[PDB]
Amino acid sequence: YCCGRKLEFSPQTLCCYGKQLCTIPRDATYYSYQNRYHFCEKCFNEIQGESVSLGQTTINKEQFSKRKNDTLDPELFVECTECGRKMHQICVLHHEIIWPAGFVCDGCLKKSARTRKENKFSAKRLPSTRLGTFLENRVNDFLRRQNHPESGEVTVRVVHASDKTVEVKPGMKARFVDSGEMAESFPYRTKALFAFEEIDGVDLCFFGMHVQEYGSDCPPPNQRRVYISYLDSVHFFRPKCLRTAVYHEILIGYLEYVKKLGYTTGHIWACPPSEGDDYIFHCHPPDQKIPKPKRLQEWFKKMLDKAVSERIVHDYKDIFKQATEDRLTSAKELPYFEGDFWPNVLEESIKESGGSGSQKLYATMEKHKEVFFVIRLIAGPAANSLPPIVDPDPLIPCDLMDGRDAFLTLARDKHLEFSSLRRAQWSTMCMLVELHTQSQD
């Protein structure tokens, strides 16, 4: 081999199909049918009977194969078209679409005074936006002030933007929508953006984020609000000593930008994802740990405190204090975001109380206050006389980046891990190719 290392891809984590939020981890015993419907051992033996509803066809348990999630797929090699030398495709970052003529190794390149043809499928050449330019300018200006020899050029690209609506769930709908007290749905625009760092002339995707933006056309209570759906990272930014600062620069810049457009309030649900290796990026580095809730909360506070000192954020409060200042009385006054905690808990509260949308509201808000940040961007008289929000950036149709599920599925299907610098660089290269090609159609 090339680098003298025997390399294989790790067994991934699978869903178990007989419980929402159930997964089959690596090396665990499980049952599968047609390599499509997998069941963890516990969920399988708990099914009363030997019949399993799937899809809705009923399948017998003897048709299932008993397996352990221990399959190690070896890494692929590519062969130099001149040396015959076999090298890991990931080590040399050879992509057939980028260099269709074939793989020529570095040694054969030097022995002809030759360089690889320019990678036109780069992060920088992804279409720009006013938002992405604003963010990457902030990050790169910050990095240049640090004068650290290891920092590379950072690219920020918005890769998806589409119109969506969040639907009020049945319990809140029956309580408040059917009475005409609350809009049935709330229109918003979702945006997905990613940050890339050039390391040794090679792109590395190290940050990703999806947001929901509710414009001046949105009925209350969601008007002029932005909400972070999810944020994720791969911890290989160089230098490490500027990693946290760069994340904060992106988030503060996003808040600064939406404030300029006229959004008044930002919302953050500071809740770590469940333990696992996939959130936005597939197969995180094993030594990158998910922060515990208190540390994640302090991390967001540190970011927002800097935003306050920069006069970008006027102030921020937890949901409980914010409700108290706003003199809230009913759950219909709480902003209603897609996939957020509050729509789910309000369904429970109405059911538990026998049909009230106010009973446990303040107690529930106090119980979870430290997890929910309400960020005031525009305050005072200015927040009441604002012009309509007009976004100069166009819609970006990209089904791979409409939500986080599609990109995870592509990475799983093509072994695109972010578990090491070399694999993350390869997964970044493949991800950029997909983004450049899907758009060309």
Ligand SMILES: COc1ccc(C2(C(=O)N3CCC[C@@H]3C(=O)Nc3cccc4[nH]ncc34)CCCC2)cc1
């Ligand atoms: C205080 O410590 C912190 C605070 C914030 C972060 C950020 C960050 O990446 N995260 C906040 C929670 C989600 C994501 C994260 O840690 N994801 C994962 C890491 C490892 C394995 C994983 N599996 N699944 C997801 C996942 C970094 C930028 C955005 C916030 C990281 C550490």
Ligand SMILES: [Zn+2]
């Ligand atoms: Zn190698």
Ligand SMILES: [Zn+2]
């Ligand atoms: Zn299960």
Ligand SMILES: [Zn+2]
């Ligand atoms: Zn060669």
